[PDB]
């Protein structure tokens, strides 16, 4: 009753929005937020694809995807806390000491 292409288009829209939020924001926190949006959109795409074929592999890939999302969020927020501790700011333009 729901077209597969509609669910895939919804997932693509959310992935594109997450990527835009990851690019346009100097704050490290909003970059992590955009990463969470992107990985959740990819997991949503896996669920849509699994529900189309009637297979249980889509929700398995969702489970692995949100395990990755949880662990990456944990690591990224620990790094954010360390950056805020030792530099007292979260602007990512200032973290550019290696170049060339």
């Amino acid at each position: 009753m729901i077209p597969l292409q509609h669910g895939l288009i919804l997932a693509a829209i959310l992935f594109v929005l997450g990527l835009t939020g990851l690019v346009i924001r100097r704050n490290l926190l909003f970059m992590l937020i955009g990463l969470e949006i992107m990985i959740n959109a990819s997991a949503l795409a896996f669920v849509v694809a699994g529900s189309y074929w009637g297979q249980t592999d889509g929700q398995v890939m969702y489970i692995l995807a949100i395990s990755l999302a949880a662990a990456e969020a944990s690591i990224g927020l620990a790094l954010l806390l360390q950056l805020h501790r030792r530099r007292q700011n979260l602007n990512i333009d200032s973290v550019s000491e290696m170049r060339g």
Partner: protein, 54 residues
């Protein structure tokens, strides 16, 4: 006229082009994370556009 060995300079020309191209390519390594994300997205656009064209 020839005492500076012009053919040697004509064969040294590719080294000059290689140094200039390397200096031009090193401007992408500015050290900014947002530019690295942007370059990844640009390359994704380029790869997907090439796959759709071909």
């Amino acid at each position: 006229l020839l005492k500076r060995d012009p053919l040697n300079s004509m064969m040294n020309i590719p080294a000059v082009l290689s140094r200039f191209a390397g200096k031009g390519l090193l401007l992408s390594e500015n050290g900014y994370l947002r530019w690295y994300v942007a370059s990844m997205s640009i390359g994704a656009v380029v790869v997907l556009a090439l796959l759709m064209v071909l």
